[PDB]
Amino acid sequence: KKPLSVFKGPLLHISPAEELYFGSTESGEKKTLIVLTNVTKNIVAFKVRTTAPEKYRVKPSNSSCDPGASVDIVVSPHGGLTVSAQDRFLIMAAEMEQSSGTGPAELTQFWKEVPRNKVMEHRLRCHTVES
Amino acid sequence: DEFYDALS
Ligand SMILES: [Cl-]
């Protein structure tokens, strides 16, 4: 078969690997997907960042992924706004402790404490909309 | 050019 477009790192496998392509939904909106897969034995906390925070809905954008599990990130531009080839997305990932919390205040404290050399990052680029 | 926190 065809190999899946997936970036592989030591914490997460990310699909697609580099280029984000947006499609049209039956509910009348543009939408792309970012699938994260935790390939470690511990919880991986992740955050999603973008160069155009005013343009895109990103859900989830500040959460965590259980070991062995996958998380789908739904990205959709707001109505009337167009996708730009300069729009980029940043995936920040860091491995959490064995008995670490995943609630809002625990995630805030984790990212305030984690040393920056243990934070893995991967960038994605948006492609212009085709229809 | 820099990155900003995404919004749900
Ligand atoms: Cl179409």
Residue A108's H or E segment, with its range, is: helix A104-113
Composition of chain B by helix, strand, coil, percent to 5:
0, 40, 60
| CA distances to A5, A45, A72, A130, B6 from A24, in Å | 20, 30, 17, 9, 21
The alpha carbon of A19 and the centre of ligand 1 are apart by a number of angstroms equal to 19
Please tell me the distance from the alpha carbon of residue A42 to that of residue A80, in angstroms, as a whole number. 41
Cβ neighbourhood burial of A59 (10 Å; 0-12, 13-18, 19+): middle
Report residues near ion ligand 1: CB below 5 Å. A 24, 131
Q: Please, which experimental method was used?
A: X-ray
CA quadruple B4, A16, A31, A126: dihedral positive or negative? Answer: positive
Minimal C-alpha gap between B1 and chain A (Å): 7
Please tell me the distance from the alpha carbon of residue A99 to that of residue A72, in angstroms, as a whole number. 24
State the resolution, in angstroms.
2.2
Composition of chain A by helix, strand, coil, percent to 5:
10, 45, 45
- Cα A89–chain centre separation: 8
Interface mutation target, options A34, A36, A58, chain B, most CBs of B under 10 Å? A58
**CATH hierarchy code of domain A7-126:** 2.60.40.10
Beta carbons of A38 and A73 less than 8 angstroms apart? no
Give me the residue spans of the domains in chain A: 7-126
